[PDB]
Structure formats: C-alpha cells, structure tokens
Design a protein around this ligand. Structure first.
Ligand code: R9S
Lengths: 237, 300
C-alpha cells in the first residue's frame, strides 16, 4: 500500500526500489507579453529517479523541445514521466529492475501503472512522506547539467557521493532528506552553511563537500537549526 | 398472451413479474400469472416473507416453450420448469383460468416501460451470460458473482458479463498509453463494439440486462457491470451519434423505473458525476441529465 513513517525501514532492505519525483519535469517562467497578457516560457526539466539503498540517481533531462506544439503540458508531463520511467526499467537487465516504484505525488500513480502494464510484478506505490526531492535543482552540479542540455539526455549520479563507505543507507538517506529539506526551506542559508569554510571542497566526481564525520555532525546540526529557525520565522510560533 | 401457471404457493412470498409485484400468503390458492405480453423477455422473481436473503428469479421468453413454477420443499425455493406435453399444459392453464386462480399481468395500454427497459435484451444473449444449457430459462439471484469479481469462486453459478478493465492491455495499445487512457474510443469502438459485441445492439442488451439484475436482485456485480458499460461510452470522444441518442433513452427509462429508496446503493456517485458533468458526452445525455437532476439531485 502507501509508504509512510510506519514502514520506513523497508526503503533500506534488499528489494530493489526506486523513488520517482516528477516535480521538476515541467518548469516555466511566467511573463507579460507586449499586449499585457501572460505567457509561459518552458525551461529544461528532469525526472528524479532514486534508489534510496545505493544512492544511484537516474536523472533524465527533459529538454524544452518535448513540449513543442503540445497542449495540456501539466498533464502530458505526468505521462512523459511515466514513459521515461518505463523505458528506464526496460533498459535495465532483469536482475537490476525494481520490485517497487514509489511516486512522490499521487497524480503519477495512474500514468505509471498504465505505462508498466507489461510489468505486473512491479508494485507502484504512493507515499504519505513529504519528501523534499523538488530541491534537487538546488544542487549546483544537477542544476548545471539540466540547464546546459541541448537535447534529451540521461545523466547518472550517486547522490550519496562516497558516504556509504562510512555510514548505512538509513543514515545516508536521513542526511540527504535533511540537506534537501534545508535547501527547500532557505536555499541561500543552506548553501552558505555548506560552502562557508573555503578549506572543505567538493571532489570533481561528487555533489557535496568532503566533510569529516565530525564536520558532518556540525553541518547536520546547522541544517536542523535553519529548518526550525525558518519554521519559527514563518509561523509566528 | 402467455401464462406461467403455479402448482401451488406453499410458502408466503412476494412474487415479481417484470416491474410489478404482489404478496401471496402461505397456502393461498394462487395458480399463477396470465396475459403476459408476447414479444419480450420476462423475469419472474421471489422474496420469501421469512427471509432477507433468498432473493432470486427466472428470465424467460414464452415463445421458447411452456414454463411453470413449482415449490421444491427440499431446496426451499420456487423453481421454473418446462412442460414438454403441450396439451397437458393447455388443459392445466384452462382449468386455473376458468377457476380465476391467476393474477393478470397488469399492463396499462399507454405504458411502454417494459419494452423500453428490454429493447435490446434477447433470451439467447442472457443464456450466454448465465449458462445452464439444459434449461431454456435462466436463474439469477442476489449473491451470484461475475467472472470479473471471481478473478479478483464456483464458475458454474457465475454471471459471464463481458470483462471491462480500463487498466488492462486489452484497453491500452502499446505506445498509445495516455491517448487510450484519457480517450477510451479505441477500447469502445475497435475492441468492444467491432471485436466482441459485433454491434451496439448486443452492447446495449448486456447493459440493460446488467441494470435489471442490479435492480430486481440487488446483484452487486451486475451493478458494477452496468456502470462500467456506461462509463466506457461516456469516456469515449468518438461514439456513433445514434448510439449516444439511444444511450440517453435507455438510461432515462432505467433512472425513471429505479425505486427512489435504492438510489443510495444502486447508483455510483463518481460514475454519474463524471458521465453527466466532466466526460466527453457531458452534453449528449439531455433526457438522462434532466431526470437525474429532478429525481436524485443529492447524489450529484
Ligand atoms: C545510476 C548509477 C549510480 C551510481 C552508479 C551506477 C549507476 C548506473 C546504474 N545503476 O545503472
């Protein structure tokens, strides 16, 4: 059924699973036309497909050309997401295919279920969790590869860098959700915390800085403060 | 004008004949129903005074043979039987009529309700949905499950309605996923009409039969089938104009005949709201939208 707080440990068992987030597939700037009407201009998007156990990110870049001369784009975006996810599963060898796909938004259930009719053994599941995967486009290297794309393109990342050498998936996923929740709530503050110390760099093959275990504890603390300080900055509470 | 004689009425029972019904008392001298109109399928149905289960009946057509009812005290129900001896049957019916022991199928001359509810329903199509080829009449009851219901147990006692599933390979062409899911025209016109039913008459026959089993027996699987066949037309952008005009007539008379006090269990909110207000055919069912709005405005 639905993925929630009760069944959280299931994300880190040995059944291959993917999260699919479609929140950055269809992206627009809204602007005034010469005649004072409103129009949109699409920019490049991405499907965020993540194995929470391994950190393996399948970032399918959605080039603005996909939308050319199409109607009902917010609706097409869900079906395009489902088509690309189904094409990705079909491209993986059988033993690498997921046993479950968990969609971060319930409007993705029918489009993905219909695209995956050929895979009756793959379970399509909603989640009750409010996952901050929309802030993926706040990670500079992911934002850069999306915006520079001149055609449809799949880029493969490990969103946990080398963390699984030192911590479990459960802890790596908790660190990722904390970083993304922070970036989502106050992107400027969150980025300041991550890059303030010029001695700590990002390896060329990494997304996040090269923190020692003690430095990760300090960073994680600063992220939790930012999130509660913003929740007391908004809510008058 | 045909007759279904009864041997006796040993147990107190509400007897239905099509849209009519009457109470018979335990051992009341009742010997059946006369003046049944030739040219249509009929249903005779039963609800025992002592049982809130035991709700059941027989689809028949008097042109196919001579049919009577006899109570079976072992199986505890009124059974339909065929009398093969024509002259014995004529002589039984003549005696009962002379002694005025038969109720009269009480049809108002102005009244086309039954024709309108059964316009496309044929006994030969009923017999393929019900399947008991030793009999010319078909037994249905409250509890019988559909083939679709059983896929999700006893196959011999099932309703063999055409399986309709919007999230099936049958419904969705590879590479036409979004198109076939949002516009079911392919599934309606090519798979169901041209492929399985052959024509709109067979499709409407099964739709009308599903409704009648839902209304007369409170058969849940028949109700699901009636709604599915309506939703498959309403969710199609491309439907022949004659099929839409005829659907509007069929649904009008079904909504008109539905007992007011069953519209809460027999009508699916989501399907009717979609069909009348959101779907491709939201502006195609004028008669059905006006009666539903005037009779069941709460549902919507
Ligand atoms: C997506 C990814 C991440 C890290 C390593 C390798 C991959 C590619 C794959 N799993 O097919």
């Amino acid at each position: 059924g639905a993925m929630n707080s009760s069944n959280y440990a299931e994300l880190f068992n040995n059944d291959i699973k993917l999260f699919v987030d479609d929140t950055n597939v269809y992206r627009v700037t809204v602007h005034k036309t010469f005649e004072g009407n409103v129009a949109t201009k699409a920019i490049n998007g991405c499907i965020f497909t993540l194995n929470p156990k391994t950190g393996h990110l399948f970032l399918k870049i959605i080039h603005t050309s996909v939308w050319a001369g199409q109607k009902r784009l917010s609706q097409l975006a869900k079906w395009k997401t489902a088509e690309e996810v189904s094409a990705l599963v079909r491209s993986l060898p059988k033993e690498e295919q997921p046993k479950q796909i968990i969609v971060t938004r319930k409007a993705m259930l029918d489009p993905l279920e219909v695209h995956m009719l050929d895979f009756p053994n793959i379970a399509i599941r909603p989640t009750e969790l409010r996952l901050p995967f929309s802030a993926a486009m706040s990670i500079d290297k992911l934002s850069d590869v999306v915006m520079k794309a001149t055609e449809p393109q799949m880029v493969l990342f490990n969103i946990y860098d080398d963390w699984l050498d030192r911590i479990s998936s459960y802890t790596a996923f908790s660190r990722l959700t904390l970083l993304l929740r922070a970036l989502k709530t106050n992107e400027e503050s969150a980025k300041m915390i991550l890059l303030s110390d010029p001695t700590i760099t990002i390896k060329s093959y990494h997304l996040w800085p090269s923190f020692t275990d003690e430095q990760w504890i300090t960073i994680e603390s600063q992220m939790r403060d930012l999130i509660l300080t913003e929740y007391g900055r908004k809510y008058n509470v | 004008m045909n007759t279904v004689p009864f041997t006796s009425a040993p147990i107190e029972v509400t007897i239905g004949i099509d849209q009519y019904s009457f109470n018979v008392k335990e051992n009341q001298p009742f010997h059946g129903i006369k003046d049944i109109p030739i040219g249509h399928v009929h249903v005779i149905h039963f609800q025992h005074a002592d049982n809130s289960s035991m709700r059941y009946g027989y689809w028949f057509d008097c042109r196919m043979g001579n049919f009577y009812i006899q109570y079976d005290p072992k199986d505890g129900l009124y059974k339909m039987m065929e009398e093969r001896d024509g002259a014995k049957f004529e002589n039984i019916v003549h005696n009962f009529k002379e002694r005025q022991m038969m109720v009269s199928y009480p049809k108002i001359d102005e009244d086309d309700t039954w024709y309108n509810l059964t316009e496309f329903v044929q006994m030969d199509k009923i017999r393929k949905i019900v399947r008991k080829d030793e009999n010319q009449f078909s037994y249905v009851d409250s509890s019988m499950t559909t083939v679709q219901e059983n896929e999700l147990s006893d196959p011999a006692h099932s309703l063999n309605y055409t399986v309709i599933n919007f999230k099936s390979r049958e419904a969705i062409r590879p590479g036409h996923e979004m198109e076939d899911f949002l516009d079911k025209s392919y599934y309606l016109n090519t798979v169901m009409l041209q492929g399985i039913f052959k024509n709109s008459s067979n499709y409407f026959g099964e739709l009308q039969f599903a409704f009648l089993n839902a209304m007369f027996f409170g058969n849940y699987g028949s109700s699901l089938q009636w709604h599915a066949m309506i939703e498959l037309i309403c969710s199609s952008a491309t439907v022949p104009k004659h099929m839409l005009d005829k659907l509007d007539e069929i649904l009008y008379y079904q909504i008109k005949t539905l007992p007011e006090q069953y519209s809460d269990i027999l009508l699916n909110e989501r399907v009717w709201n979609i069909c009348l207000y959101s779907s491709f055919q939201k502006n195609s069912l004028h008669n059905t939208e006006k009666i539903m709005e005037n009779k069941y405005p709460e549902l919507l």
